[PDB]
Homo-oligomer: A and B are copies of this chain.
Amino acid sequence: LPRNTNCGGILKEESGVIATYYGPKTNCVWTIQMPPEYHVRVSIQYLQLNCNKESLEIIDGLPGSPVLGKICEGSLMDYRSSGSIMTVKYIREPEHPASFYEVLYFQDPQA
């Protein structure tokens, strides 16, 4: 599965992985955009962030849309978008080096 480790971007792959970006930017916004009648499924098997210095947010659309969660510790997380777009946003404090994270996404259904 194509692994994305850029700080954000619009993603159109039918499936892929978002994993930790290690550069200087402190706010990365990945927007997953599927064809019109499709949905996006997002899975996070295990997440363990420092909730004091960083977080991951799942947004049901473009930035500005309803938030589905701002999460820093959990596992077995499954999110489905209500439309064709979902955004994943990671944020950290400048002084803090990013923790490891891996987010899987799928077009739902697959084609």
Contact = CB atoms under 8 A, between A and B. Distances in A.
Interface stretch (A6-14, A20-28, A69-77, A94-102): A69-77
Contacts of A57: 76
Interface in A20-77: 51, 57, 66-77
Number of copies: 2
Interface in A73-104: 73-79
Interface residues of A, number: 16
B76 A73 contact: no
A74 B76 contact: no
A69 B51 CA distance: 17
Nearest 3 Cβ contacts at the A-B interface: A71-B74, A73-B73, A69-B77
